[PDB]
Design a protein around this ligand. Structure first.
Ligand code: HEM
Ligand code: BZI
Length: 290
């Protein structure tokens, strides 16, 4: 119903966005201490998903386009607790590059994090345009963690995602950790390297249903790993489980499927002129010798 047309920031081209990529990537390298030396990679990915995950396919409300996370209603969404750190991270980036829209910056931060953490290339398109504060979606559009596969499946229909896209997207839970103070879930062992480990862990660990100090159930393993009830639902549902096994046994296929679904997620709600530039594929720092 609402239409949002991609409008390229004036006169900008690939090299401009590569420059923004690189500033994000260098800071990512710089600020290595954050969250017990996990770095900001994971929270930037989470931020990019939460700013896109407000989308509603039925009326094209929410979505990354409007960059509405900058307004207090959305930034104070309880579902977004902890994400202020990612916002604070990108603040000097925005100040150095004031011409990039908020939506483009938030989504590009997510792409950059994934690639720098050795995940797949994620094609990325520019052209999100900031929209006014009253276009900010209401709280409560992001998913709950204490639910089952049916919830997860239904939830993601609203973002136009199918079983394979959901299971692939969840693979980002290889990254970073939960924070009791943020979500009511107790962090387990944490990584900042993007791999298909989330699926391996699901299938190979000895999971026990435990209560954490916030009185929420989560699945914990002797090895110090953890899963959310919605994570675990991927192996409880037989359709989800088949895909989990696939990604666990095929790193390349996971990367390819993640790349597509993550780009899709970041682009939901946006109309790209026939006219628009092709998606950009940014080189990593290591590819550039930086
Ligand atoms: C049913 C879906 C999902 C639910 C219930 C869920 C729930 C959560 C929870 C509770 C947190 C911890 C927040 C805090 O304690 O710091 C979180 C962390 C995170 N989520 Fe999800 N999530 C879902 C899907 C996704 C998807 C689609 C992505 C991205 C493609 C993703 C990326 C992340 C990342 C990277 C973290 C780690 C953040 C950090 O370490 O600071 N999540 N998830
Ligand atoms: C968020 C972050 C890390 C995770 N590891 C397993 N499930 C997770 C959710």
């Amino acid at each position: 119903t609402l239409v949002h047309v991609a409008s390229v920031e004036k006169g900008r081209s690939y090299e401009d966005f590569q420059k923004v990529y690189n500033a994000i990537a260098l800071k990512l390298r710089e600020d290595d201490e954050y969250d017990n030396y996990i770095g900001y990679g994971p929270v930037l990915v989470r931020l990019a998903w939460h700013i896109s995950g407000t989308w509603d396919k039925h009326d094209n409300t929410g979505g990354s386009y409007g960059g509405t996370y900058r307004f207090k209603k959305e930034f104070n969404d309880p579902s977004n607790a902890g994400l202020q750190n990612g916002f604070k991270f990108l603040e000097p980036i925005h100040k150095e590059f004031p011409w990039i829209s908020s939506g483009d910056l938030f989504s590009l931060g997510g792409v950059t994090a994934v690639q720098e953490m050795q995940g797949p290339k994620i094609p990325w398109r520019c052209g999100r345009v900031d929209t006014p504060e009253d276009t900010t979606p209401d709280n409560g559009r992001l998913p709950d963690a204490d639910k089952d596969a049916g919830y997860v499946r239904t939830f993601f229909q609203r973002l136009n995602m199918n079983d394979r896209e959901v299971v692939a997207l969840m693979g980002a839970h290889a990254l970073g950790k939960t924070h009791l103070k943020n979500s009511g879930y107790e962090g387990g062992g944490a990584n900042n390297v993007f791999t298909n480990e989330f699926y391996l862990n699901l299938l190979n660990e000895d999971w026990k249903l435990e209560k954490n100090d916030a009185n929420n159930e989560q699945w914990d393993s002797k090895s110090g790993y953890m899963m959310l009830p919605t994570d675990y639902s991927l192996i409880q549902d037989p359709k989800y489980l088949s895909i989990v096994k696939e990604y666990a046994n095929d790193q390349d296929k996971f990367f390819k499927d993640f790349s597509k679904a993550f780009e899709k997620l970041l682009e939901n709600g946006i109309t790209f002129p026939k006219d628009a530039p092709s998606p950009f594929i940014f080189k990593t720092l290591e590819e550039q010798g930086l």
